[PDB]
Amino acid sequence: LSAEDKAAVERSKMIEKQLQKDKQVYRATHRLLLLGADNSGKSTIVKQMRIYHVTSGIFETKFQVDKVNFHMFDVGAQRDERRKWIQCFNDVTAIIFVVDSSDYNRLQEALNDFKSIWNNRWLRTISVILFLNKQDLLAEKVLAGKSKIEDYFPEFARYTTPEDATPEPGEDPRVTRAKYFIRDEFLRISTASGDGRHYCYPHFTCSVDTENARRIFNDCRDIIQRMHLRQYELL
Amino acid sequence: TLANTGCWDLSSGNKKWIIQVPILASIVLNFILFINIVRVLATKLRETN
Amino acid sequence: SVSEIQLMHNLGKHLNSMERVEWLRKKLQDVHNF
């Protein structure tokens, strides 16, 4: 009797020490979910973040910047339906939503997908990092002028470049007007319901740009800091 | 080991600064942190209007 | 300065003065009764 209980307790305490160590590492790393249609260059981003070395189903990529670990998960071999397996991702630090800004015709589908993610009952606290990928293709298309964004979005005719926008001096004013209109459209969905519980961080991303990791790190730092402030009822 | 006279209710000189100075040193440091914390609050709210 | 300690020191001086003053008062009566 006494020997068995002592052995059982000793084993239980042995498991406890392992769990405490696992708790330290689990809290240390930040989990991220990568989402987007295939028209978006999600794969290229994965290769870029693979530089930071640390039936198929979900895949995980581990990258470290400034001595903090991220685990980015992507769903490659999964069914189109996503109303069920998206619920288990309610504890991730953030969701990286990649959008191909140069499709126009498929842009509305991205808006609807963002709308569903943003307004989900269970994803009410997970911030969304919006990456408008491959802006170079959008810039080239705008200069070419063969395809006019006005046809797909009639509002674009009555759109004016935001005063707070900071375009590059050497970039066509047409390009910035187009890209910022796309940013405004996404932010309209973001601000329609989301007020203070979770936030969206728009970004202009290129497939070859290596700055994506730094943007994610900064976005994660802001999210954690905002969460800590909310715990004190300061923000 | 220096005065040991009556109760310690009275002050025998500058030795009170042994306890007073560290307490005051804490207030300024906390005050500096308080201003710094207000700074990030003014920054984040600026980022979300 | 630290207020609570400062108040404590002031109280000690105030009470000590009262003991001295009351000491003077009874000495005044004793000499008057000499």
Q: What residues contact A143, with CB distance under 8 A and at least 6 apart?
A: A172, A174, A175
Which amino acid, B38?
V
- Rounded Cα distance between A86 and A204, Å, is 25
Distance of CA A49 to the CA centre of its chain: 14
CB-based burial label for A136 (10 Å; 0-12, 13-18, 19+): middle
Note whether C11 contacts B: Cβ–Cβ < 8 A: yes
Per-residue b or e along A5-40, where b marks 16 or more CB atoms closer than 10 Å to that residue's CB: eeeeeeeeeeeeeeeeeeeeeeeeebbbbbbbeebb
Neighbours of chain C (3+ CB pairs under 8 A): B
Q: How many CA atoms lie within 13 A of B25 on its CB side?
A: 6
* Cα separation values, A46 from A40, A74, A78, A92, A201, Å: 12, 9, 18, 18, 20
- Rounded Cα distance between A147 and A134, Å, is 17
Note whether B23 contacts A: Cβ–Cβ < 8 A: no
Per the DSSP assignment, residues forming a β-bridge with A129 are A96, A201
* Cα separation values, A35 from A31, A44, A128, Å: 13, 13, 10
Contacts of B23 in chain C (CB under 8 A): 2
Per the DSSP assignment, residues forming a β-bridge with A128 are A95, A200
PDB experimental method: cryo-EM
Contacts of B8 in chain C (CB under 8 A): none
Distance of CA A185 to the CA centre of its chain: 17
Neighbours of chain B (3+ CB pairs under 8 A): A, C
- Rounded Cα distance between A201 and A118, Å, is 12
* Residue tagged 């000495």 (tokens): C27
With a CB-CB cutoff of 8 Å, which residues 1-30 of chain B face chain C?
7, 9-11, 16, 19-20, 23-24
Q: Left (φ > 0), alpha (ψ -120 to 50) or beta: where does B6 sit? A: left
Structure tokens given for A81: 């339906």
Contact B40 A225 (CB under 8 A): yes
Per the DSSP assignment, residues forming a β-bridge with A100 are A133
Note whether B43 contacts A: Cβ–Cβ < 8 A: no
* Ordered DSSP codes for A151-186: HH-GGGGG----TT----TTS-HHHHHHHHHHHHHH
3-class DSSP assignment, residue A204: strand
Q: Which helix (H) or strand (E) holds A203?
A: strand A200-204
Structure tokens given for A217: 């790190």
Structure tokens given for A153: 């979005």
* DSSP state at residue B15: G
Q: How far is B8 from chain C (nearest CA, A)?
A: 9
Contact present, C13 and B10 (Cβ < 8 Å): yes
